[PDB]
């Protein structure tokens, strides 16, 4: 029942190996080979050893000769085997693109068989293994994402020099007796009342010995004993189906905030002759999911009978697929700190632990295949990936089986996208549906993330109409343009493009002169944006920032304006979709922000950056997604309350006030006694009238207080008397140009205010520190302290990351106080005492001890 991952390898180019058979012979010399940990691409392995500078900085990645990655590389290891009484297997996936496998001088599998990143291989190497020092070697072939059913980077970033060739998951060494236990899973079915489930346990047993056997498969499912005995001819595999097991009052798995995240255990041993032969432990969640088309044709998800608006971002791993379990948990925890409920994985489907963590945290996941490369090559015409040939078909089907087998018992998984872009043709789709059936993968299948239908499954109920680059806030509120990206249907991949990270991140990824060019000439190409010509520069963003904000006087000016613009836009993108969710006609049913994060240090399509720092786009998404929320509609000036939580709320007061930039209140409305339903329902407080005498740029302060008088949401907008308007006729696929621009340049002259800071920290016994900061607007006039950003820093003024704040980027009127809370690992302080750096738009910068 042993399954031990290979901890590491030594790697080298096949340019250095003239005899393949030699590598896997015990004693083969490996002087000058590179030691690498498990889950390394070739280039990630070279970085581990020195060998090139940090690709996260400037154009370092360009200085890597890529030619060396157009030939195979070897991954080699020794294995000590004390006792050959047990059978021996190599069980693995994640080979990019394909490999020959060698044990002790014998080629056990070729690249024609071991082919495709997602395919699983269970290689019986019993005949090759001997007592003592054994050796195993993979000759990994070059990866081309357009030719191979693998992973590529579309236009998200820049191309890794090795194109991710390597082994990016574990290779397991399995030991067992005559009988191998495989593919153990639990089919679970809950009644609609959610108080009774039925469990069908299924498990494969394979007799790899020379003789016929009886095997008993026995153990526990959800704490209940189970046992079946079957016969197996030599070399026979069987699927064992256990009689149905009833489960009363199951601990139902819920998305975060809707209840708990319990997973049950399955524990099984296959015995032969009254002796354990193999063993497997796994988990499953008791949870119903559905994804159906509503009367408007939009894809509508529900979990456990509760419909949900999907509010998420597109998730990506590291550009060089460097794996770290804590980092993965840190990234999914940020999902919840944002108030989001879902992540989409367009290809790049992460190792199991990622899904264990999403399960444990209650983050929903939307895995599927990616566009714009080999996956869609047979259906995507003149776009990138190659037409399919006969050998492609069984690789794609085996990839689907293997992913379906991996993914089926994770309750976070809410669907599989079998297409992205183009939906599969009938033959490809049929192979996917067959693979999923064979794996008992029973979750919703979505044909595409675009509007494109598949022949069998049908309409997607989703859209990808853009945009991916600058559009003003009001754009998201559009319902009139059926070929655009307004708040209706399921928005599976959309953003307003550029997302300048914090100054602290900027200074780590770009040179002074690259940064100088970024503010002075946004039209210039930026390596840390995209390899795509369409998204190669920041021109649309820079032009709108100038038009709407005012010209940038320096780098600092440009960055600070970038943050307001990103906060404003991302906030509107999300708020519009929350509002329109309960529309009678063409409701919004989903929004996946493009993207949650970036594969590397970037200037676009991120909420949190590669270092886990949090900028305007982050805080804006967090503001929009708070559980009891007040917001202002850019289209019609309606003030709207959203309740994200699982219970209806009552006796809410919504208070809306307009101020000129000199602090003069120009409008007040107090709406008491509001009720709002659960799980995304809304209430309208008031429609703000056109008010006379407003400054060109003015402020709207929205405050929601519960029946106890507690302030539960504060939302401040910087607004203009001059409207953003669209030139809909100038629209391209990725954006819509503006015919006129809001004037928010009044912010440039907003008078100075003051804060107002005290902080203290508590090192907990769970290895985390909580820093509490109390901020007060301490000025003696009428001016608000506007957009005040607090950052946990060490003694050198460097941000402590990752971090989670309850609230941030706050605005306080004179006399007003707010208390803020930041949590992080004590160890990420690295022995420094904590301080807090506090910067406001109109309050300057100070740091206080904590």
Ligand X SMILES: N[C@H]1[C@H](Oc2ccc([N+](=O)[O-])cc2)O[C@H](CO)[C@@H](O)[C@@H]1O
Interacting span for ligand X (CB under 6 A) from 61-69, 153-161, 541-549, 653-661 = 153-161
Site string for ligand X, 308-337 (x = CB under 6 A): ------------------------------
Per-residue three-class SS string for 724-756:
CEECHHHCECCECCEEECCCCHHHHHCCCCCEE
β partners of residue 171: 92
Residue among 75, 468, 824, 841 that touches ligand X (CB under 6 A): 468
- What separation in angstroms does the CA of 706 have from each of 151, 712, 796? 49, 7, 41
Q: Answer for the pair 281, 264: CB distance below 8 angstroms, yes or no.
A: no
Cα 772 to chain centroid distance, Å, stands at 29
Residue among 116, 431, 466, 680 that touches ligand X (CB under 6 A): 466
For residue 58, state whether it binds ligand X (rule: CB under 6 A).
Answer: no
Cα separation, 97 vs 117, in Å, equals 6
Phi, psi angles (nearest 5°) of residue 397 = -65, -40
Cα separation, 93 vs 89, in Å, equals 13
Residue among 270, 418, 464, 545 that touches ligand X (CB under 6 A): 464
Instruction: List the interface residues with ligand X, window 617-676 (CB under 6 A).
Output: none
Q: What count of residues does the chain have?
A: 850
Q: Per-residue DSSP letters for 190-245?
A: E-TTSSEEEEEEEEEEEE-SSS-EEEEEEEEETTEEEEEEEEE-TT-EEEEEPPPE
CB of 421 to ligand X, least distance (A): 5
β partners of residue 726: 738
CB closer to ligand X out of 465 and 578: 465
CB of 143 to ligand X, least distance (A): 18
Per-residue three-class SS string for 687-709:
ECCCCCCCCCEEEEEEEEECCCC
CB closer to ligand X out of 370 and 403: 370
CB neighbours of 274 closer than 8 A, spacing ≥ 6?
Answer: none
Interacting span for ligand X (CB under 6 A) from 459-467, 550-558, 739-747, 769-777 = 459-467
Interacting span for ligand X (CB under 6 A) from 28-36, 74-82, 149-157, 305-313 = 149-157
Applying CB under 6 A, the site for ligand X has a residue count of: 14
Interacting span for ligand X (CB under 6 A) from 53-61, 154-162, 295-303, 558-566 = 154-162
Cα separation, 24 vs 241, in Å, equals 40
For residue 154, state whether it binds ligand X (rule: CB under 6 A).
Answer: yes
Interacting span for ligand X (CB under 6 A) from 315-323, 461-469, 625-633, 772-780 = 461-469
Instruction: List the interface residues with ligand X, window 483-502 (CB under 6 A).
Output: 493
Using Cβ positions, the residue closest to ligand X within the complex turns out to be: 733
Instruction: List the interface residues with ligand X, window 69-88 (CB under 6 A).
Output: none
Cα separation, 486 vs 475, in Å, equals 6
For 448-468, letters b (16+ CB in 10 Å) and e give bbbbbebeebebbbbbbbbbb
Cα separation, 405 vs 96, in Å, equals 20
CB closer to ligand X out of 157 and 759: 157
For residue 346, state whether it binds ligand X (rule: CB under 6 A).
Answer: yes
CB of 152 to ligand X, least distance (A): 10
Interacting span for ligand X (CB under 6 A) from 234-242, 299-307, 464-472, 806-814 = 464-472
Specify the DSSP class assigned to residue 476.
G
Residue among 247, 371, 396, 744 that touches ligand X (CB under 6 A): 371
Cα separation, 722 vs 392, in Å, equals 56
CB closer to ligand X out of 215 and 420: 420
Residue among 341, 465, 586, 818 that touches ligand X (CB under 6 A): 465
CB of 328 to ligand X, least distance (A): 21
Query: CA-CA-CA-CA torsion for 465, 469, 471, 477, nearest 10 degrees?
Result: 40
Site string for ligand X, 2-31 (x = CB under 6 A): ------------------------------
CB closer to ligand X out of 155 and 267: 155
User: Could you give the count of Cα atoms lying within 13 Å of 423 in the half-sphere of its Cβ?
Assistant: 25
For residue 688, state whether it binds ligand X (rule: CB under 6 A).
Answer: no
CB of 339 to ligand X, least distance (A): 24
Token pair of 39 as six digits: 């889950």
CB count within 10 Å of CB 143 equals: 24
Closest C-alpha to 633, from 676, 692, 575, 714: 575
Site string for ligand X, 387-426 (x = CB under 6 A): ---------------------------------xx-----
**Structure-token match 């708020």, residue found:** 575
CB of 40 to ligand X, least distance (A): 25
CB of 447 to ligand X, least distance (A): 14
CB closer to ligand X out of 76 and 604: 604
Interacting span for ligand X (CB under 6 A) from 26-34, 150-158, 291-299, 813-821 = 150-158
Residue among 35, 670, 733, 764 that touches ligand X (CB under 6 A): 733
Closest C-alpha to 637, from 669, 675, 661, 676: 669
Maximum pairwise Cα distance, the chain: 93
Interacting span for ligand X (CB under 6 A) from 230-238, 334-342, 460-468, 584-592 = 460-468
CB of 494 to ligand X, least distance (A): 8
CB closer to ligand X out of 422 and 786: 422
Cα 327 to chain centroid distance, Å, stands at 12
CB closer to ligand X out of 287 and 417: 417
Interacting span for ligand X (CB under 6 A) from 87-95, 332-340, 463-471, 805-813 = 463-471
- What separation in angstroms does the CA of 808 have from each of 337, 354, 499, 614, 621? 11, 28, 18, 10, 12
What is the binding site for ligand X (CB under 6 A)? 154-156, 346, 371, 420-421, 450, 464-466, 468, 493, 733
């Amino acid at each position: 029942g042993n399954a031990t991952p290979i901890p590491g390898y030594v790697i080298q180019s096949s340019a250095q190996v003239s005899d393949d058979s030699a590598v896997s012979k015990p004693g083969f010399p490996t002087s000058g080979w590179y030691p690498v940990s498990s889950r390394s691409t070739v280039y990630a392995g070279l970085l581990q050893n020195g060998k090139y500078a940090d690709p996260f900085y400037s154009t370092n990645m360009q200085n890597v000769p890529a030619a060396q990655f157009s030939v195979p590389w070897w991954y080699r290891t020794d294995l000590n085997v004390d006792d050959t009484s047990s059978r021996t297997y190599l069980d693995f996936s994640g080979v990019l693109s394909k490999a020959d496998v060698w044990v002790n001088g014998t080629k056990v599998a070729t690249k024609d068989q071991v082919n495709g990143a997602y395919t699983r291989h269970d290689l019986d190497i019993t005949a090759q293994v001997h007592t003592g020092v054994n050796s195993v070697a993979f000759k990994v072939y070059p990866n081309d994402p357009n030719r191979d059913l693998s992973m590529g980077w579309i236009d998200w970033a820049q191309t890794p020099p090795d194109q991710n060739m390597g082994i990016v998951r574990d290779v397991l060494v399995r030991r067992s007796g005559a009988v191998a236990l495989r593919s153990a899973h639990v089919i679970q079915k809950l009644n609609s009342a959610l108080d009774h489930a039925d469990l069908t346990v299924k498990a494969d047993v394979r007799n790899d010995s020379a003789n016929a056997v009886q095997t008993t498969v026995a153990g526990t499912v959800a704490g209940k004993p189970i046992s079946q005995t079957v016969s197996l001819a030599a070399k026979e595999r069987k699927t064992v189906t256990f009689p149905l097991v009833g489960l009363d009052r199951p601990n139902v798995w819920w998305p975060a905030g809707m209840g708990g995240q319990h997973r049950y255990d399955l524990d099984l041993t296959a015995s032969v002759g009254g002796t354990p032969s193999d063993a497997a432990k796994s988990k499953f969640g008791v949870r119903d999911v559905k994804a159906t088309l509503n009367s408007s044709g939009g894809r509508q998800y529900s979990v456990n009978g509760k419909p949900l608006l999907i509010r998420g971002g597109g998730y990506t791993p590291d550009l060089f697929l460097r794996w770290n379990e804590t980092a993965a948990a840190d990234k999914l925890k940020y999902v919840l700190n944002l108030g989001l409920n879902t992540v989409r994985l367009e290809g790049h489907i992460e190792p199991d632990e990622f899904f264990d963590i999403a399960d444990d945290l209650g983050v929903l996941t939307m895995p599927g295949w990616e566009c714009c490369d080999k996956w869609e090559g047979q259906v995507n015409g003149e776009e990138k990936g190659e037409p399919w040939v006969e050998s492609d078909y069984p690789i794609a089907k085996a990839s689907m089986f293997s992913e379906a087998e991996r993914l089926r018992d994770h309750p976070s998984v809410i669907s599989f996208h079998i297409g992205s872009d183009f939906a599969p043709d009938r033959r490809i789709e049929q192979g996917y549906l067959d693979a999923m059936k064979a794996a008992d993968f029973l979750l919703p299948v979505i044909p595409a993330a675009s509007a494109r239908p598949s022949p069998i499954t049908g309409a997607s109920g989703m859209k990808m109409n853009g945009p991916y680059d600058y559009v003003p806030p009001v754009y998201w509120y559009d319902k009139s343009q059926k070929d655009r990206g307004g708040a209706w249907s399921f928005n599976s991949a959309t953003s307003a493009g550029v997302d300048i990270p914090t100054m602290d991140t900027l200074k780590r990824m770009m040179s002074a002169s690259e940064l100088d060019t970024m503010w002075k000439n946004p039209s210039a190409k930026q390596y840390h944006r995209s390899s795509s010509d369409t998204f190669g520069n920041l021109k649309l963003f820079g032009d709108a920032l100038t038009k709407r904000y005012g010209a940038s006087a320096n780098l600092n000016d440009f960055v600070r304006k970038a943050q307001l613009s990103q906060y404003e836009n991302v906030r509107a993108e999300f708020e519009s979709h929350s509002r329109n969710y309960t529309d009678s006609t063409n409701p919004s049913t989903g929004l996946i922000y493009w993207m949650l994060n970036s594969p590397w240090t970037s200037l676009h399509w991120q909420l949190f950056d590669a270092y886990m720092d949090q900028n305007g786009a982050y805080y804006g998404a967090k503001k929009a997604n708070e559980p009891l929320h007040i917001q202002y509609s850019h289209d019609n000036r309606s003030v709207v309350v959203i309740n994200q939580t699982s219970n209806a709320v009552s006796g809410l007061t919504a208070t809306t006030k307009l101020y000129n930039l000199d602090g003069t209140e120009k409008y007040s409305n107090t709406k008491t006694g509001l009720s709002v339903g659960a799980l995304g329902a809304k209430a309208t407080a008031v429609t703000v009238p056109a008010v006379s005498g407003l400054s060109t740029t003015y402020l709207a302060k929205n405050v929601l207080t519960d029946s106890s008088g507690k302030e539960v949401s504060r939302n401040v907008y910087w607004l203009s008397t001059k409207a953003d308007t669209l030139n809909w006729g100038g629209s391209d696929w990725y954006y819509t140009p503006q015919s006129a621009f809001a004037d928010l340049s009044g912010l440039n002259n907003l008078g100075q205010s003051a804060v107002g800071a005290t902080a203290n920290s508590v090192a907990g016994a769970d290895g985390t520190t909580t820093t509490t900061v109390t901020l007060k607007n301490t000025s003696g006039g009428r001016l608000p302290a506007f957009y005040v950003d607090s950052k946990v820093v060490d003694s050198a003024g460097k941000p402590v990351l990752p971090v989670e704040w309850n609230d941030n980027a706050v605005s306080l009127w004179p006399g007003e106080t707010t208390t803020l809370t930041a949590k992080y690992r004590t160890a990420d302080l690295k022995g420094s005492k904590p301080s807090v750096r506090i910067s406001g738009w109109n309050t300057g910068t100070q740091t206080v001890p904590a």
